[model samples]
Target: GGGGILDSMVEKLGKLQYSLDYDFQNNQLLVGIIQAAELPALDGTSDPYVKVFLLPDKKKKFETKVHRKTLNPVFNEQFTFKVPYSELGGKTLVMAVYDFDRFSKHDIIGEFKVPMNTVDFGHVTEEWRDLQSA
Candidate 1:
């Protein structure tokens, strides 16, 4: 159930640090994009940015500011989504890092997804996850 020789080089895209929290009184989900580290070098440098979405539906989306020429970019931006507690059971949090191109379409470096139900939403949850191939 895995790639054979084609995947021998075996390496991760990078690592991303983020935090998740649910506000009961406001019925809102708060997501924080902290930073990324050890990203693969794109050309001589990379313009990295983060894109986030609530799974099952991408209509609700958020993006962070793009940082120029950095493998380790600090994006301490927080975004909030309005969602009922009942609806959180089936939702997933997807956050991806991409290389922004000035003259062409941006390319996704890697991503991580967390099923909302998998983690406790009673308190603010912070985590560092490895970025996987898109």
Candidate 2:
């Protein structure tokens, strides 16, 4: 428990480009994982995928498919969560980018958190973020 997640790497890891949109008709929040670049490569390269969570319910978490082998990955992929419009505020979005290892534990590359209140659900809210050390 002592040598935990924060005990590992420490630095400006990568940049995660993403966008958020809300579909009022279906009561869903759409997340677009645009790209991730300049990530740390352990061994040859890192297999990165993003894990998403809308606070209050960790039961259902969304994730992007793992990118094969590269520091930069292109993912025009989108994921949705069934969260109504009225409940937008007070909800938090947590995206954790990780490196998938078949032999060992998955490593956290970087991450960011945004509140639903910051997003303009009426339209697409696109924003680029610098990932912090996990």
**Most TM-score-accurate candidate:** 1
TM-score of each: 0.91, 0.86
Which candidate wins on lDDT?
1
Local accuracy of candidate 1 as per-residue lDDT tens digits, 45-119: 789999999989769578999999999999999999898989988999899999999898898899989999898
Query: Over the stretch 49-121, how does candidate 2's per-residue lDDT look in tens digits?
Result: 9998888675677888999888999988888878788887889988889998899999888898988887777
The per-prediction tally of clashing pairs is: 0, 0
Per-model lDDT:
0.90, 0.85
For model 2, give the RMSD to the true fold. Answer: 4.9
Provide the global lDDT of candidate 2 against the true structure.
0.85
